[PDB]
Design a binder for these strands. Structure first.
Ligand SMILES: C[NH+](C)c1cc(NC(=O)CNC(C)(C)C)c(O)c2c1C[C@H]1C[C@H]3[C@H]([NH+](C)C)C(O)=C(C(N)=O)C(=O)[C@@]3(O)C(O)=C1C2=O
Ligand SMILES: [Mg+2]
Ligand SMILES: [Mg+2]
Ligand SMILES: [Mg+2]
Ligand SMILES: [Mg+2]
Ligand SMILES: [Zn+2]
Lengths: 217, 126, 132
RNA sequence: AUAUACCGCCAUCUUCAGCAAACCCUGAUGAAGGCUACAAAGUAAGCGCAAGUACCCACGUAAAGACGUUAGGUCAAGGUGUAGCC
């Protein structure tokens, strides 16, 4: 009968009202639409790009809004069902922000040099009975040589769903929920951290509410 | 077990096929969330490729009508000492003043561009 | 290369005891001696026949407690009290053990003509210091 | 008789630093390969150097120096397979 605290959110669409945390104006002022140049583009990001202004590409914010809805819904549902959400980035200007965001929530953050086999040779590297993360959220999909991160391939190899902010120079290919958006501006990255932190915290408090209600019932 | 073939399909397709066969006995935590709210595109591997012949990107260049006059303004009356702010929404630069006044007269009813330009030039001079 | 008392490295599956593991350059730096007889000091006469009897004892007790001596013996020699302290395993029956103790206990007394005493020390399995 | 069957005990590179179980990734899942600390797939038990010991110091000298190389040296130190003599 606990299949009502693990099946109910899954028939309510937007069970966590995550649709009231972001608007195409909030994103526009966070400067999410600003992308890279036509010379740093990706063929697979071409379907998400509104167009090019002065050889500087811009991302379609309606598509960003729909993708961000789906992403934040998924993140809220995994945080409710008590997964492990690992936030991965290689920025160096936002490492402090991502680790502090994980610690203000209760999820985890890899912001440092990804050692080979972290998710793949995981039992040998950590211990025989380790729980690998049930959702990896990349705030920046590229590494510091401007190439896709090992984790995006190894998360897929290990069948861990991935939510990721894909900019113009990124490969939205092996990312389950791509969110077309700027990740080079402090306001944009701050808004992403704020949105994901709020989703995860609201999800965990709602999980506690339904467990309390069913325990009293 | 699991399928570490990241290239054949998606994590959803691989996991669904393996739990149908009966080798993944427990379903993962994320499978029902995927089956409830799937993404707009299943994450299947696609190899990037270089366009070679007469293949061009579908991305267009953003050009509005005001830019015909914007380009003309900078040409004659260059960028003034009134500097752009950019940090504040609703910033109305001097060139924006010019295009708004010019577009005003246009709506009112004028015809040749040079006459339009001199009239809005005296208008901003006032 | 030096090949004196050095058990070479196999593949990491070779049980080996402290004694066998240490090489001859650790002979009293880490190991010590398996036979404590006084003849090898500065002034004494009979050290040669002590060693001739020493190798005899090692091989007699090796063939008389067949396949139960875990590691090698400690042939100490104070007064006329030769001692054959042992580390013998726990597989054969205790009546057989006490028998070979008595048999040796008297036979080396009548071979060497002095008190000879065996103080066995039973151990479950042959010990492993490291796997080489 | 065969060191070209060997144990044993050594020479030599070595007045070296490598040899590596077990995994993982890359190469369209080929022989193979796995580097960037403002970091791009490598993680590593074990042996070796190192460390600790001997001599007068922490210096120097000793000892030590793996995996393998050279069918390198010895059936004559001893033991010994194979073939032989009685
Ligand atoms: C004729 N060659 C092919 C040969 C044959 C045998 N043994 C046999 O084939 C005999 N086999 C039978 C007994 C019939 C079963 C051999 O046994 C040998 C050798 C080569 C020698 C060469 C030696 C030589 N030494 C004496 C100065 C030399 O130049 C070196 C060296 N590295 O300095 C050697 O390698 C040598 O010493 C050597 O090992 C040989 C043989 O052992
Ligand atoms: Mg030497
Ligand atoms: Mg030397
Ligand atoms: Mg040393
Ligand atoms: Mg030869
Ligand atoms: Zn970027």
């Amino acid at each position: 009968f606990n299949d009502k605290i693990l099946n109910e959110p899954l028939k309510h669409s937007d069970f966590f009202n995550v649709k009231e945390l972001f608007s195409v104006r909030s994103l526009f002022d966070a400067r999410v639409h600003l992308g890279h140049k036509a010379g740093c583009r990706h063929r697979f990001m071409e379907p998400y790009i509104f167009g090019s202004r002065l050889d500087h590409d811009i991302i379609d914010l309606e598509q960003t809004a729909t993708h961000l809805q789906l992403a934040l819904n998924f993140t809220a549902h995994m945080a409710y069902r008590k997964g492990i959400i690992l936030f991965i980035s290689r920025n160096r200007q936002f490492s402090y922000l991502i680790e502090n965001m994980a610690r203000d929530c209760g999820e985890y953050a890899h912001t440092r040099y990804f050692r080979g086999g972290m998710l793949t040779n995981a039992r040998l590297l950590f211990g025989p009975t380790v729980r690998l993360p049930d959702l990896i959220i990349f705030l920046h999909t590229l590494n510091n040589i401007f190439e896709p991160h090992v984790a995006v391939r190894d998360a897929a190899k290990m069948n861990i769903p991935t939510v990721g902010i894909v900019d113009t120079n990124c490969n939205p290919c092996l990312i389950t929920y791509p969110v077309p958006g700027n990740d080079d501006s402090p306001l944009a990255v701050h808004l992403y951290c704020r949105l994901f932190q709020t989703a995860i915290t609201r999800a965990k408090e709602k999980r506690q509410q339904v467990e309390a209600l069913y325990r009293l019932q | 077990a699991g399928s570490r073939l990241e290239t054949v399909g998606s994590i959803f397709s691989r996991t669904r096929d393996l739990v149908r066969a009966g080798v993944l006995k427990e379903k993962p935590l994320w499978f029902d969330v995927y089956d409830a709210f799937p993404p707009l595109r299943e994450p299947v591997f696609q190899r990037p490729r270089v366009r070679y012949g007469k293949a061009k990107a579908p991305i267009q260049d953003i050009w509005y009508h005001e830019d015909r006059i914007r380009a003309k303004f900078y040409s004659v009356y260059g960028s003034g000492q009134r500097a752009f702010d950019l940090f504040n929404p609703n910033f109305k630069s001097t060139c924006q003043r010019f295009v708004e006044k010019y577009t005003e007269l246009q709506k009112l009813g004028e015809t040749d561009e040079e006459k339009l330009f001199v009239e809005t030039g005296k208008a901003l001079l006032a | 290369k030096n090949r004196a008392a050095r058990v070479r490295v196999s593949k990491g599956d070779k049980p080996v005891t402290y004694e066998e593991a240490h090489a001859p350059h650790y002979i009293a730096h880490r190991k010590g001696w398996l036979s404590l007889h006084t003849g090898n000091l500065d002034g004494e006469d009979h050290a040669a026949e002590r060693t001739v009897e020493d190798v005899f004892l090692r091989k007699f007790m090796w063939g008389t407690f067949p396949g139960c001596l875990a590691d090698q013996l400690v042939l100490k020699r104070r007064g006329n009290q030769l001692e054959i302290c042992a580390v013998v395993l726990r597989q054969l029956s205790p009546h057989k053990y006490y028998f070979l103790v008595g048999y040796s206990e008297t036979l080396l007394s009548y071979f060497y003509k002095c008190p000879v005493r065996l103080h066995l020390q039973t151990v479950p399995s042959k010990v492993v210091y490291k796997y080489l």
